[PDB]
Amino acid sequence: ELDQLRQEAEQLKNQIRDARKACADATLSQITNNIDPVGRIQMRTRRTLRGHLAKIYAMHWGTDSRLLVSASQDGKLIIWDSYTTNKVHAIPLRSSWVMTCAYAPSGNYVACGGLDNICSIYNLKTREGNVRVSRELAGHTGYLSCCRFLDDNQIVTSSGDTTCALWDIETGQQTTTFTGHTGDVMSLSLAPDTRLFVSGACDASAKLWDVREGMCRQTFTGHESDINAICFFPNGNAFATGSDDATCRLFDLRADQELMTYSHDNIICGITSVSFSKSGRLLLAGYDDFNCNVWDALKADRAGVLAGHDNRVSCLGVTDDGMAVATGSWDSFLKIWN
Amino acid sequence: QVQLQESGGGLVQPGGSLRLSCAASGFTFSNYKMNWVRQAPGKGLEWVSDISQSGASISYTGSVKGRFTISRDNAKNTLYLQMNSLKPEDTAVYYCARCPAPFTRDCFDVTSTTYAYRGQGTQVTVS
Amino acid sequence: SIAQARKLVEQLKMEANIDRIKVSKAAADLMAYCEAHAKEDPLLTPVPASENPFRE
Amino acid sequence: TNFAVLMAHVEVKHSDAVHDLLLDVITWVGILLSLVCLLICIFTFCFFRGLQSDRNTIHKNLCISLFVAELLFLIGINRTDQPIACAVFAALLHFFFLAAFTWMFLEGVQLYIMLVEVFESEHSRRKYFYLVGYGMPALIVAVSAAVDYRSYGTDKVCWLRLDTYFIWSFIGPATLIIMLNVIFLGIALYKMFHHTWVIGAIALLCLLGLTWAFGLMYINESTVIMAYLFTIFNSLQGMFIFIFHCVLQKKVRKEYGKCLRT
Amino acid sequence: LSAEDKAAVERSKMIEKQLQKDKQVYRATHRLLLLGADNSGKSTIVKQMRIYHTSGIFETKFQVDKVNFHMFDVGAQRDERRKWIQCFNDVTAIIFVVDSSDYNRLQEALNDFKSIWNNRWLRTISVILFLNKQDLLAEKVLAGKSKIEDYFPEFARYTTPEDATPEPGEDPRVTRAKYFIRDEFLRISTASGDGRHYCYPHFTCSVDTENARRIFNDCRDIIQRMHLRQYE
């Protein structure tokens, strides 16, 4: 009955706990005791992009390391050239409350979503010079939190109704739906080889998903409050999470437990965004404090600080060739660091 | 992994008394605001009592204002409630409830149909 | 209900039977990758002004 | 020779003491201690992106007007040896001084539309501000010269004459502006001690030039202290505007802290 | 500069020319967030104010004396709201509607008000409070079937305050109960405030037509206080 099932669940949880305790034969910080610190990392602004009218809420770099897309809650999606600070495109939206955006790897499409439970897909290269709406994808019962392209005909969405979905653009219907969380989902990140993806939920829960089968394979716990950001390490064998309790942590998918935790005693505000560097030696985090912190991944110490914002930092990104860092905050400005 | 476990239920006569204990694991006990909620046979989730980080601020609902007493032990990781004179309108299932964020005075989403950080509950019957 | 408990039991059964390795191997792999691509990371090793499109 | 003759309508001024040297030194110190702070105000209001608004426009143009007027004043007031060369000065000073008051007037209007018509409009009004700031001084100087084109300059100082009533082409309009500001000032006051005090009410007096009336009450002997009071305040407006609208403002302090530490 | 650079700069200049029009249109429109429970009458107030003119949000536009208000109502969401509420930290006002004829559910409304009043991202946003369905309260109190002191003991020692205005000619008991309910909210509002935001209470029923003016007057008061803060 129900009681027998609950007892079985507790027993298997205990067995999993023993299996995970039996594997930690070494400490990450003790092997890395002999590694040289990177030193002090001072970074300066090279450009400041002005033009939004309200909070900037999402951002994304392009495959060409030269073009950006940015989204604001005044109802705008702007496409920038970061070399000359020129504006290439500016698109108005049907719904003002936007919470995510993305580029496509081929540079032909963009996507957006928000409180209205819809993902809108836009075409950049048309017969004329106009950017027009190609698709409206519907089927969720909650707001969209994140979306990322796989190719020109497949997209992934995560929502605040506790489920994730894979969509085929040409027809307009779901091919597979992933369930298992209890609270809302907050973020996603795609593998370098594009066959799996990770998810973090408004709980102390993160999961790994196989796209083709459509089922979960691993779950990870360890936080105290909501998870806010997540991303992949370059080799696809790690990920780093931030949470609304002033703690970041690193997980690996082969030892199946955490390895390092980045925290401090005077930090009492949560993390909003996370992003890795090219070689894996820098980990960049945003705090509503209102700062950005640059941590050394293998030592758990702050290598640098970035300041110059007057309000909460909400989005952060790095390039594919590793030549810049872009930061966007609730004061309506974007800044590029190098 | 956040865990909350309740204890102290049972059956009593009208006018009786008993004590409820909530035990905790998986977080720093001191930084969080704490609550008592209950569910009666045929209604939704209600709110009974509230206590703050240090214990210098308390709050009760009207219907139990003169009878039930709340306390917290931050070193033993426990929340305590004491019941002195019971009416038949108190037969219910009792849960102890946490807050989503540390260092905060607001408290959203405790009495919801699904909430992450909430225990299994205990049964109290008076007849 | 019964269905939720059964699904949770099945999920835990699937999860508790996965091959694992030790943590020292993960630490070694991460450190090795970090060392391999160190000379090409610009924000650790700044580039001369002649090749920097945001500074030049 | 001093600063009062701008509003001094009494041409029968006949002194019998050593007041003249004292007044001359006071006026020179007052003007020359300005022209250092006015540059600071113009720089702060021009090259800082976070301070842009309509009030910034008004302050910036007011500072420019005062700077140019007082620079001309210290250079060409007493060059009475060139009959057809200082006449042009008697015009330029006039025009620029008028612009000063007009800009002050607009500041009072900016008060009304933030406390009586509280809601923003869909259309901008910057062009009307520039059209009233420099339009009316131009119209007054043009018509005023048309009625009389030979009264610019006299035997004593190359300023607007006194022996005819043509001096009222400056004193006349000026008083009007002052009165209107007084009305607006009352509104601002009626809402500071009732809905919720020294610093703000004083800072409003440094831009609405209500002190100039001191110069209108200097009339005959035994009243020199009024001519003192006038000179001691007005000749230092450039000093006042800097103190209260550059040092005591949190926005400007934050802007200096951000820019200088970068 | 070649052909390409000139083309790029010209396109950028046109884009800025468009954003200038957008900024003027944006800053002259006011935005309000509407909140209430399922027994509130909130839908009826929406339908009433519409005379002044699946999906996860609903929008209404109305206009008073050439000022434009956009009111936003939340639908098709779950029962947890500690996340999307943060999107509403720069609105002019929150309109909170509450049913005052149901004694069993007033405590939940009070706790809701406490949670909204004390959040971190909403310490500058003011609240306009509507106490709805007054005729039902009048009928229930006059009939005398259920006693208010069963749920709130302190009502046994409450006296009508001197500044009351029972204008229409009602029974004194209606005035007592009505003002007791109002004071229950004013106590929370006054206790934790810091002079940075206020609460405006009103009594409303299902046939009133004066709600739009009430919102209008409260918004003028809010904006004057902002402009007075600008002059120190």
Taking the C-alpha atoms of residue E122 and residue B102, their distance in angstroms, rounded to an integer, is 17
* Helix, strand, or coil (residue C24): helix
Residue D202: count of CB within 10 angstroms of its CB: 11
Taking the C-alpha atoms of residue E176 and residue E230, their distance in angstroms, rounded to an integer, is 41
* Helix, strand, or coil (residue A26): coil
Q: Let me know if A42 is exposed, middle or buried by CB neighbors in 10 A (0-12, 13-18, 19+).
A: exposed
- First-to-last C-alpha distance (Å) of chain E: 50
Nearest residue on chain A to C6, judged by CA atoms? A5
Residues of chain A numbered 130-189 and touching chain E (CB < 8 Å): 141-143, 160-161, 183-184
Does E67 contact D at CB distance below 8 Å?
Answer: yes
Residues of C in contact with A322 (CB under 8 A): 40-43
Which residues are CB-contacts of E41 (< 8 A; sequence separation ≥ 6)?
E97, E99, E132, E133, E206
Residues of C in contact with A279 (CB under 8 A): 33-34, 37-38, 40-41, 44
Contact (CB, 8 A) for C40 and A279: yes
Contact (CB, 8 A) for B10 and B125: yes
Measured in residues, chain C has a length of 56
Map A202-268 to HEC letters: CCCEEEEEECCCCCEEEEECCCCCCEEEEEECCCCCEEEEEECCCEEEEEECCCCEEEEEECCCCCC
Residue D71: count of CB within 10 angstroms of its CB: 15
Q: Let me know if D177 is exposed, middle or buried by CB neighbors in 10 A (0-12, 13-18, 19+).
A: buried
Residue A46 CA, distance from chain mean position? 25
Given an 8 Å threshold on Cβ–Cβ distance, is C18 in contact with A281? no
Nearest residue on chain B to E148, judged by CA atoms? B62
Given an 8 Å threshold on Cβ–Cβ distance, is B100 in contact with A245? no
The DSSP string of B56-112 is S-EEE-GGGTTTEEEEEETTTTEEEEEE-S--GGG-EEEEEE--SSSS-S---SSSS
- First-to-last C-alpha distance (Å) of chain A: 61
**Chains A and C are in contact, defined as 3 or more C-beta pairs closer than 8 angstroms:** yes
- First-to-last C-alpha distance (Å) of chain D: 46
Taking the C-alpha atoms of residue A316 and residue A273, their distance in angstroms, rounded to an integer, is 6
Q: Is B77 left (phi over 0), alpha (psi -120 to 50) or beta?
A: left
Nearest residue on chain E to B63, judged by CA atoms? E151
State how many domains chain A has: 1
Taking the C-alpha atoms of residue E112 and residue A179, their distance in angstroms, rounded to an integer, is 31
Amino acid letter, residue A221: T
Map chain D to HEC letters: CCCHHHCCCCCCCCCCCCHHHHHHHHHHHHHHHCCCHHHHHHHHHHCCHHHCCHHHHHHHHHHHHHHHHHHHHHHHCCCCCCCCCCHHHHHHHHHHHHHHHHHHHHHHHHHHHHHCCCCCCCCCCHHHHHHHHCHHHHHHHHHHHHHCCCCECCCCCCCECCCCHHHHHHHHHHHHHHHHHHHHHHHHHHCCCCCCCHHHHHHHHCCCCHHHHHHHHCCCCCCHHHHHHHHHHHCCHHHHHHHHHHHCCHHHHHHHHHHHCC
Taking the C-alpha atoms of residue B12 and residue B21, their distance in angstroms, rounded to an integer, is 17
Token pair, residue E11, equals: 């396109």
Instruction: Determine the distance in angstroms separating the CA of B100 from the nearest CA of chain A, rounded to an integer.
Output: 6
Closest CA to A281 of A35, A34, A43, A12: A35
Amino acid letter, residue B71: S
Taking the C-alpha atoms of residue A336 and residue A83, their distance in angstroms, rounded to an integer, is 10
* Helix, strand, or coil (residue E3): helix
Taking the C-alpha atoms of residue A210 and residue A180, their distance in angstroms, rounded to an integer, is 13
Amino acid letter, residue D179: M
Contact (CB, 8 A) for D193 and D187: no
Given an 8 Å threshold on Cβ–Cβ distance, is B108 in contact with E81? yes
Taking the C-alpha atoms of residue B94 and residue E34, their distance in angstroms, rounded to an integer, is 33
Apex CA A228: angle with CA A223 and CA A231, to 5°? Answer: 95
Nearest residue on chain A to B98, judged by CA atoms? A225
Domain containing A292 equals 2-337
Spell out a b/e string for A152-184, using b for 16 or more CB atoms within 10 Å of the CB, else e.
eeebbbbbbbbbbbbbebeeeeeebebebbebb
Token pair, residue B63, equals: 């219907």
Taking the C-alpha atoms of residue A239 and residue A230, their distance in angstroms, rounded to an integer, is 7
Which residues are CB-contacts of D222 (< 8 A; sequence separation ≥ 6)?
none
- Sheet (strand A291-296) strand order: A271-276, A282-287, A291-296, A301-306
For chain A, helix, strand, coil in percent to 5 are 10, 50, 45
Taking the C-alpha atoms of residue E139 and residue B41, their distance in angstroms, rounded to an integer, is 30
Q: What are E31's strand-pairing partners?
A: E70
Q: What are B34's strand-pairing partners?
A: B51
Estimate the crossing angle of helix E211-230 against helix E42-49, to 10 degrees.
Answer: 90
Beta strand A205-210 pairing with A216-220? antiparallel
Measured in residues, chain A has a length of 338
State how many domains chain D has: 1
Token pair, residue A70, equals: 């940015």
Taking the C-alpha atoms of residue D257 and residue D259, their distance in angstroms, rounded to an integer, is 6
Does C12 contact A at CB distance below 8 Å?
Answer: yes
Closest partner residue to E15 among A73, A90, A202, by Cβ?
A: A90
Closest CA to A165 of A151, A145, A194: A145
Spell out a b/e string for B6-15, using b for 16 or more CB atoms within 10 Å of the CB, else e.
beebeebeee
For chain E, helix, strand, coil in percent to 5 are 50, 20, 35
Which residues are CB-contacts of A152 (< 8 A; sequence separation ≥ 6)?
A104, A106, A108, A109, A169
Token pair, residue B33, equals: 């605001």
Spell out a b/e string for E35-73, using b for 16 or more CB atoms within 10 Å of the CB, else e.
bbbeebbbeebeebbeeeeeebbeebebeeeebebebbb
Q: Is the dihedral of CA B110, B116, B122, B127 positive or negative?
A: positive
Up-side HSE of residue D114: CA atoms within 13 Å toward CB?
A: 16
Contact (CB, 8 A) for A86 and A79: no
Which residues are CB-contacts of D212 (< 8 A; sequence separation ≥ 6)?
D7, D174, D178, D230, D234
Amino acid letter, residue E24: Q
Taking the C-alpha atoms of residue A231 and residue A206, their distance in angstroms, rounded to an integer, is 11
Q: Let me know if D98 is exposed, middle or buried by CB neighbors in 10 A (0-12, 13-18, 19+).
A: buried
Instruction: Determine the distance in angstroms separating the CA of B116 from the nearest CA of chain A, rounded to an integer.
Output: 7
Closest CA to D108 of D175, D161, D40, D186: D186
Amino acid letter, residue E7: A
Taking the C-alpha atoms of residue A107 and residue A69, their distance in angstroms, rounded to an integer, is 11
- Sheet (strand A154-159) strand order: A144-151, A154-159, A164-168, A173-178
Taking the C-alpha atoms of residue A198 and residue A274, their distance in angstroms, rounded to an integer, is 14
Does D201 contact E at CB distance below 8 Å?
Answer: no
Chosen for mutation from B107, B108, B117 (greatest number of chain E CBs closer than 10 Å) is B108
Which residues are CB-contacts of A311 (< 8 A; sequence separation ≥ 6)?
A290, A329, A330, A331
Neighboring chains of B (3 or more beta-carbon pairs < 8 A): A, E
Which residues are CB-contacts of D178 (< 8 A; sequence separation ≥ 6)?
D208, D209, D210, D212, D213
Contact (CB, 8 A) for A147 and A155: yes
Instruction: Determine the distance in angstroms separating the CA of B57 from the nearest CA of chain A, rounded to an integer.
Output: 22
Given an 8 Å threshold on Cβ–Cβ distance, is A117 in contact with E76? yes
Spell out a b/e string for D210-249, using b for 16 or more CB atoms within 10 Å of the CB, else e.
bbbebbbebeeeeeeebbbebbbbbbbbbbbbbebbbeee
Residue with tokens 């290439």: A88
Apex CA A279: angle with CA A278 and CA A280, to 5°? Answer: 95
Beta strand A282-287 pairing with A271-276? antiparallel
Residue with tokens 């620079």: D71
Domain containing D213 equals 4-259
Residue with tokens 């023993």: A18
Given an 8 Å threshold on Cβ–Cβ distance, is B2 in contact with A182? no
The CATH number that applies at residue A56 is: 2.130.10.10
Taking the C-alpha atoms of residue C49 and residue C47, their distance in angstroms, rounded to an integer, is 6
Residues of A in contact with E76 (CB under 8 A): 117, 141-142
- CA distances in angstroms from A11 to A224, A255, B66, B116, E100, listed in the order given: 23, 21, 43, 21, 50
The DSSP string of A289-327 is TTEEEEEETTTTEEEEEE---SS-EEEEEE-SSS--EEE
Closest partner residue to E57 among A81, A84, A115, by Cβ?
A: A115
Given an 8 Å threshold on Cβ–Cβ distance, is E79 in contact with B108? no
The CA dihedral of A266, A228, A336, A84, to the nearest 10 degrees, is -170
Given an 8 Å threshold on Cβ–Cβ distance, is B105 in contact with E107? no
Closest CA to D24 of D58, D47, D4, D1: D1
Does E63 contact D at CB distance below 8 Å?
Answer: no
**Chains D and B are in contact, defined as 3 or more C-beta pairs closer than 8 angstroms:** no
* Helix, strand, or coil (residue A67): strand
Rg (CA), chain A: 20
Q: How was this structure determined?
A: cryo-EM
Element (H, E) at A29: helix A28-31
Token pair, residue B114, equals: 């699904």
* Helix, strand, or coil (residue E90): coil
Does D117 contact E at CB distance below 8 Å?
Answer: no
Taking the C-alpha atoms of residue C24 and residue C29, their distance in angstroms, rounded to an integer, is 9
Taking the C-alpha atoms of residue E122 and residue C11, their distance in angstroms, rounded to an integer, is 41
Which residues are CB-contacts of D50 (< 8 A; sequence separation ≥ 6)?
D251, D255
Please, where are the H alpha helices in chain E? Answer: 3-27, 42-49, 106-117, 134-143, 172-191, 211-230
Indicate the DSSP class of residue C46.
P
Token pair, residue A227, equals: 């998870």
Closest partner residue to A279 among C41, C53, C55, by Cβ?
A: C41
Does A268 contact B at CB distance below 8 Å?
Answer: yes
Task: Tell me, in Å, the resolution of the deposited structure.
Answer: 2.8
